[PDB]
Design a binder for these strands. Structure first.
Lengths: 148, 94, 141, 38
RNA sequence: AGCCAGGAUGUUGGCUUAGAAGCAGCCAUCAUUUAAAGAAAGCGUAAUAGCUCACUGGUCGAGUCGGCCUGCGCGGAAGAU
């Protein structure tokens, strides 16, 4: 631990992502291994690049320190170990769905999917944020509904 | 800026000094300029913790006696021969 | 990938999957089959390149039939066939004599970007710098 | 057992314990390191 | 302080040696991925391997560390009617 000019930077990045972000999920790395975070590394890298950062910050004065500003409901998501996956450009694209599918491979746990603060709820694994660019499914029935 | 507190010595001598030292105090004196040498006692622990740092002795210090600040500089100091203790101190007016 | 058996990586010959002295029977004997190393590994080897060291990892448990898997080349050996001096030093580590290229060390690390944590593409090249300076090879940037 | 006037911790494992008014060094690791004061 | 994790790379640093891969030595004691990881403190070996440790991240949730001055006590402390 350094003094105060070192912890505040962790909180600075945390508050920057918490406020300037989007849908995010939770990954309770009670016993993190080498390939768990690696698979999540590829998972987040597909998100446009390096903006889906996930560090092992579960402290009340680290990750809960940036709760007062934005995401003011992480006090209940601040106990034992909660790796907040704050997002960045875009939307909820697949972080929730990908996390559910990765957490279902016995990768450590996620505190029963505690959840971040997008909606007006707490814990609800929704699949209504996958498709957000598709614009070619409305051009498949035009050359089959003309003869008849 | 070190600020020492002190009292004027009623009785001076060998026995008196010994008594002071027994009672966690120790004598000291101020001298310099036109003014007459002023004998005072000091609480020992405070001043030992003080004189530990080196700046005590280089810088100017303020002695409070009878509610009056005298600015002095530590000139000389008697130490106990085989203990981390102060027998006596010389202060010069500054 | 979430679980692993076991694995014995070793720089084997691509050109012909049939070595005696280097590996041969030591490349698999504990339930591994040496006859299934020259009917399937070569199948996925006439579509890329053949002749340089190609580590292999065999997925044999006890069911006698395994699933051969691929891997990647070493980054430390990437400054030998794609930089300059093959040895890399020549002399004890006291006097810098090695060298690298400035146009390089960016596209040679993109080939092995399947084993880099750096989520940025340029973040993978900064780790190459340290691996390219193992001895202290000073480059002409 | 060593029984000494001067008993000491000889390694990280060595621990000092008084039992029945006797300073004793007992070491989890090294048997040689167990001591007694006498 | 325990408790759960890591304790990596170049690398097994080179030699001289029979071998030397942290651990026979002799010597340099550097750099990388950085949360952190000693060219290595102990065990271990044919030597690797393997088992710890250093530091560090998590849990926990109030005191904690070891010097100084002095008081009283403990051991050191075995003899012959």
């Amino acid at each position: 631990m350094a003094l105060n000019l070192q912890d505040k930077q962790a909180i600075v990045a945390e508050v920057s992502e918490v406020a300037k972000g989007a849908l995010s999920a939770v990954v309770a790395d009670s016993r993190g291994v080498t390939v768990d975070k690696m698979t999540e590394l590829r998972k987040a890298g597909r998100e446009a690049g390096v903006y889906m950062r996930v560090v092992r910050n579960t402290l009340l004065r680290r990750a809960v320190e940036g709760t007062p500003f934005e995401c003011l409901k992480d006090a209940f998501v601040g106990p034992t170990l909660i790796a907040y996956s704050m997002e960045h450009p875009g939307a909820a694209a697949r972080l929730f769905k990908e996390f559910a599918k990765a957490n279902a491979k016995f990768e450590v746990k996620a505190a029963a999917f505690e959840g971040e603060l997008i909606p007006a709820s707490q814990i609800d694994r929704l699949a209504t944020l996958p498709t957000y660019e598709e614009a070619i499914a409305r051009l498949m029935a035009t050359m089959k509904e003309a003869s008849a | 800026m070190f600020t020492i507190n002190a009292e004027v010595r009623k009785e001076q001598g060998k026995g008196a000094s010994r008594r002071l030292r027994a009672a966690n105090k120790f004598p000291a004196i101020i001298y310099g300029g036109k003014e007459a040498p002023l004998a005072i006692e000091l609480d020992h622990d405070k001043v030992m913790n003080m004189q530990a740092k080196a700046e005590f002795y280089s810088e100017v210090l303020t002695i409070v006696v009878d509610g009056k600040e005298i600015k002095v500089k530590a000139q000389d100091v008697q130490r106990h021969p085989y203990k981390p203790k102060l027998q006596h101190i010389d202060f010069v007016r500054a | 990938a979430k679980k692993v058996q076991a694995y014995v990586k070793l720089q084997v010959a691509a050109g012909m999957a049939n070595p005696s002295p280097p590996v041969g029977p030591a490349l698999g004997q504990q339930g591994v089959n040496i006859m299934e190393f020259c009917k399937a590994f070569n199948a996925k080897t006439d579509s890329i390149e053949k002749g340089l060291p190609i580590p292999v990892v065999i997925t044999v448990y006890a069911d006698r039939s395994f699933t051969f898997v691929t891997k990647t080349p070493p980054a430390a050996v990437l400054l030998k066939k794609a930089a300059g001096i093959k040895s890399g030093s020549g002399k004890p580590n006291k006097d810098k004599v090695g060298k690298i290229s400035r146009a390089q060390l960016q596209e040679i690390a993109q080939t092995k970007a399947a084993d880099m944590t750096g989520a940025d593409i340029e973040a993978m090249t900064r780790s190459i710098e340290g691996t390219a300076r193992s001895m202290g090879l000073v480059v002409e940037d | 057992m060593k029984v000494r006037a001067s008993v000491k911790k000889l390694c990280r494992n060595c621990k000092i314990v008084k039992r029945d008014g006797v300073i004793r060094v007992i070491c989890s690791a090294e048997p040689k390191h167990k001591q007694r004061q006498g």
